[PDB]
Amino acid sequence: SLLSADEKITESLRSTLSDVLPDQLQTFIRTVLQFSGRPEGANLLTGPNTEIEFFSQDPNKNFPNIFAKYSNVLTVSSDPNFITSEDEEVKIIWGRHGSDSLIGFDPGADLVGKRRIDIFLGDFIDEQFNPIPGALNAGKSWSDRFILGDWQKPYYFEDDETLGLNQSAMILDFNPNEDVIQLHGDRQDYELVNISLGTAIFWREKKGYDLIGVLGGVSDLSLKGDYFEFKGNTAPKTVLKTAEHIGTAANDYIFSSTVDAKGNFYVGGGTGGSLGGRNIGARDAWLAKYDSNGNQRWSRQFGSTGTESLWGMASDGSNIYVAGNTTGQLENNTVKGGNDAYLAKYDSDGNQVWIKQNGTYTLEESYKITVDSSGNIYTAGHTFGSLGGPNQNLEQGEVFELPSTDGYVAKFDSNGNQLWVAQFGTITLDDNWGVAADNNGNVFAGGNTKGSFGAKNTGTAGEYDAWLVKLNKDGQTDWVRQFGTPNYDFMWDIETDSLGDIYATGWTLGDLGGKNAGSYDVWLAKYNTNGNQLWIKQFGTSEDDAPFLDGIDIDANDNIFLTGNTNGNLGGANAGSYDAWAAKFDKDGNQLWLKQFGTPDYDTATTVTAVNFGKLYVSGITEGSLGTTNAGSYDSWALKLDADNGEIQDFNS
Numbered sequence: 213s214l215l216s217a218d219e220k221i222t223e224s225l226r227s228t229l230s231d232v233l234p235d236q237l238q239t240f241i242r243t244v245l246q247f248s249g250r251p252e253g254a255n256l257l258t259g260p261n262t263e264i265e266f267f268s269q270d271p272n273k274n275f276p277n278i279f280a281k282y283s284n285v286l287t288v289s290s291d292p293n294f295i296t297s298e299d300e301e302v303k304i305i306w307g308r309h310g311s312d313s314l315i316g317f318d319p320g321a322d323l324v325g326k327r328r329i330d331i332f333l334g335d336f337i338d339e340q341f342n343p344i345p346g347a348l349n350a351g352k353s354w355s356d357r358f359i360l361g362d363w364q365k366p367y368y369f370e371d372d373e374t375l376g377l378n379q380s381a382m383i384l385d386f387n388p389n390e391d392v393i394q395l396h397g398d399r400q401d402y403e404l405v406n407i408s409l410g411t412a413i414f415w416r417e418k419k420g421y422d423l424i425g426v427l428g429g430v431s432d433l434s435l436k437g438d439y440f441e442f443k444g445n446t447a448p449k450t451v452l453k454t455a456e457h458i459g460t461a462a463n464d465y466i467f468s469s470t471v472d473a474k475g476n477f478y479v480g481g482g483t484g485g486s487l488g489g490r491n492i493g494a495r496d497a498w499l500a501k502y503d504s505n506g507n508q509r510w511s512r513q514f515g516s517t518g519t520e521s522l523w524g525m526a527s528d529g530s531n532i533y534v535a536g537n538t539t540g541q542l543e544n545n546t547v548k549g550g551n552d553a554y555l556a557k558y559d560s561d562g563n564q565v566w567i568k569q570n571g572t573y574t575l576e577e578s579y580k581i582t583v584d585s586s587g588n589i590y591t592a593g594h595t596f597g598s599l600g601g602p603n604q605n606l607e608q609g610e611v612f613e614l615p616s617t618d619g620y621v622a623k624f625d626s627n628g629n630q631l632w633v634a635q636f637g638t639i640t641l642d643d644n645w646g647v648a649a650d651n652n653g654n655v656f657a658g659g660n661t662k663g664s665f666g667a668k669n670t671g672t673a674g675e676y677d678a679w680l681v682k683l684n685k686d687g688q689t690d691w692v693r694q695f696g697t698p699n700y701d702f703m704w705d706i707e708t709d710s711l712g713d714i715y716a717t718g719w720t721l722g723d724l725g726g727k728n729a730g731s732y733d734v735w736l737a738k739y740n741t742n743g744n745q746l747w748i749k750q751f752g753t754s755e756d757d758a759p760f761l762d763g764i765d766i767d768a769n770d771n772i773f774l775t776g777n778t779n780g781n782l783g784g785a786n787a788g789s790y791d792a793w794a795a796k797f798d799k800d801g802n803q804l805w806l807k808q809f810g811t812p813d814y815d816t817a818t819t820v821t822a823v824n825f826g827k828l829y830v831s832g833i834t835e836g837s838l839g840t841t842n843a844g845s846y847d848s849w850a851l852k853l854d855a856d857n858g859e860i861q862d863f864n865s
């Protein structure tokens with residue numbers, strides 16, 4: 213019976229949210245929701261007003277730590293939720309700019325009896341909080357997809373005698389003119405109920421009801437509207453049987469790849485399941501080795517009862533170095549506070565040689581790693597603390613500046629001893645999205661900044677620019693460069709060629725290398741070792757085109773390979789949703805080929821690795837059945853390509 217559903221839903225959500233979220237965070241959320249004109253959820257948070265300790269050195273009070281613990285803050289890009297992990301009862305999933313594919317509930321996790329509320333914000337963009345109007349993206353929004361179920365099962369589904377209020381999504385900014393709510397089954401499986409908060413979405417069967425999601429501030433919807441997408445009960449038909457398929461019932465992601473000197477191919481990333489070994493808790497890191505004929509030699513899974521991923525991997529020719537973040541305590545390590553970075557070493561046989569966890573009392577992220585020809589290892593990332601030196605934004609003065617990241621690069625020897633750590637940036641956000649060593653002892657770093665780091669930012673409202681830093685063998689800066697348009701420009705990865713020149717790839721919403729074809733476009737930029745910009749190429753379709761994550765590699769012939777996603781017809785006719793794409797360039801920026809592949813469902817490449825004089829590997833993630841039938845939610849895939857023309861080969865030979 214749906215009698216008194218409004219009172220039952222309000223009391224249940226209020227009870228759970230106010231029990232789980234720290235008072236500091238409730239105070240922050242209530243203030244933001246009131247300011248933004250999305251007040252519906254505020255009355256669900258009944259904790260007392262509490263000082264928000266933006267700069268506390270206590271890891272348990274430091275607000276960046278608290279906010280990160282209960283949130284997935286995504287990027288200015290059109291994002292899949294590449295950071296989702298089943299590590300908390302309540303999670304705020306914030307898509308920001310771009311057309312985001314938002315998921316928070318892993319259908320493959322053991323969540324029986326667990327309270328689970330995912331609070332979704334599809335856009336809710338930074339510009340709302342600008343005191344001065346007129347910003348390029350003020351008032352702009354995108355079509356976000358809120359994933360509340362798939363072909364396999366409804367999400368947040370307790371399937372018991374109650375109204376199923378213990379698990380539910382709450383979407384705070386659903387716009388039926390633009391956004392989509394994805395649901396299991398068909399429209400006859402649901403019933404919409406107008407409530408004080410907005411709309412309740414109930415799964416309905418003979419035995420009763422189960423609350424799937426609440427839409428704050430929207431009423432009078434219809435299950436016949438095109439803003440609901442129903443996925444039925446049957447896994448997608450398989451395409452691309454030539455690909456290697458990696459998947460469990462949980463969310464599985466490849467985020468990176470590399471090759472050793474014998475031509476063995478490695479992939480790795482994060483999984484909510486038991487992929488390389490028995491799941492330790494929430495998301496774990498994992499990696500796998502394949503011989504050059506496509507046979508898997510081993511898979512390994514490691515981490516903690518908290519959340520970690522492999523975000524980068526590189527080889528010294530024999531060993532495999534891996535890097536990422538963790539929210540827990542790794543084996544043979546101590547926590548520094550909040551989330552930390554780590555670097556680990558695996559030998560060719562899959563033995564974990566060591567793992568080094570490093571960081572500060574506050575939030576570190578690390579997405580990148582490189583290995584030089586001497587066998588030294590460099591990680592890179594960003595920190596809210598004072599890792600390589602004092603953070604540019606240390607404490608609150610008379611003028612409040614929101615806590616913010618600086619970039620860092622850390623150098624290690626082959627035994628994991630830290631040789632140095634360099635930290636740099638501006639008073640505002642500076643994130644790292646790239647690290648690459650040359651042959652002469654130097655190392656480059658690259659990323660995004662809201663500030664004026666290597667040049668005056670021309671954005672009127674702190675839109676991102678790209679930055680590049682060259683460090684010497686001792687970690688001292690030789691130069692800082694910055695490039696961009698007045699709009700957002702976002703870098704994903706960098707790499708050097710055999711001459712020591714540095715290349716970066718990203719997306720732009722403006723005219724960076726040329727006239728923007730529409731929406732996001734791809735760019736590739738080249739700088740010389742002395743900091744001079746040589747060229748920027750920009751290309752795309754009228755739709756959304758971008759590299760993603762480990763988006764560049766450079767082979768021994770100085771061919772450049774790029775990869776990412778597109779929802780246009782970039783390398784061919786789009787198969788549906790986003791597809792993966794890859795491209796090859798020469799060292800002068802001439803485009804040699806451009807290919808597109810994927811399923812009718814959401815796909816993106818996440819990594820590209822070229823074998824010298826051998827195959828090209830493009831790997832990524834999918835909601836479709838790529839290689840074989842999807843086992844649950846996100847699965848992963850690797851494609852073996854002819855590097856001369858981008859044509860897909862059978863993975864196994």
Ligand SMILES: CCCC[C@@H](F)CCCC[C@H](C)Cc1cc(O)cc(O)c1
Nearest residue numbers: 241244245304306331333338341342614
């Ligand atoms: C469910 C509630 C949503 C809360 C969070 F999910 C996101 C809101 C972030 C607040 C705002 C962006 C920060 C801020 C402060 C400032 O002082 C200057 C700024 O430009 C920007």
Ligand SMILES: CCCC[C@@H](F)CCCC[C@H](C)Cc1cc(O)cc(O)c1
Nearest residue numbers: 285286287338614615616640641643662
């Ligand atoms: C793995 C993806 C993580 C992406 C993060 F990079 C998101 C940044 C948070 C946004 C924030 C509201 C903007 C902002 C910062 C700032 O330092 C000053 C501001 O006024 C405003």
Ligand SMILES: [Ca+2]
Nearest residue numbers: 287289307309
């Ligand atoms: Ca986004």
Ligand SMILES: [Ca+2]
Nearest residue numbers: 307308310334
């Ligand atoms: Ca969005």
Ligand SMILES: [Ca+2]
Nearest residue numbers: 334335354356
């Ligand atoms: Ca939206």
Ligand SMILES: [Ca+2]
Nearest residue numbers: 368376379423
């Ligand atoms: Ca439920």
Ligand SMILES: [Ca+2]
Nearest residue numbers: 493495516518
């Ligand atoms: Ca884990």
Ligand SMILES: [Ca+2]
Nearest residue numbers: 549551571574
């Ligand atoms: Ca830390």
Ligand SMILES: [Ca+2]
Nearest residue numbers: 617637638640
């Ligand atoms: Ca900074």
Ligand SMILES: [Ca+2]
Nearest residue numbers: 676696697699
């Ligand atoms: Ca810019």
Ligand SMILES: [Ca+2]
Nearest residue numbers: 732752753755
């Ligand atoms: Ca485009």
Ligand SMILES: [Ca+2]
Nearest residue numbers: 705762764765
């Ligand atoms: Ca790369």
Ligand SMILES: [Ca+2]
Nearest residue numbers: 788790811813
């Ligand atoms: Ca697709």
Ligand SMILES: [Ca+2]
Nearest residue numbers: 460462844846
């Ligand atoms: Ca899966």
Ligand SMILES: [Cl-]
Nearest residue numbers: 286287288289
């Ligand atoms: Cl971002």
Ligand SMILES: [Cl-]
Nearest residue numbers: 339340350351
């Ligand atoms: Cl806005």
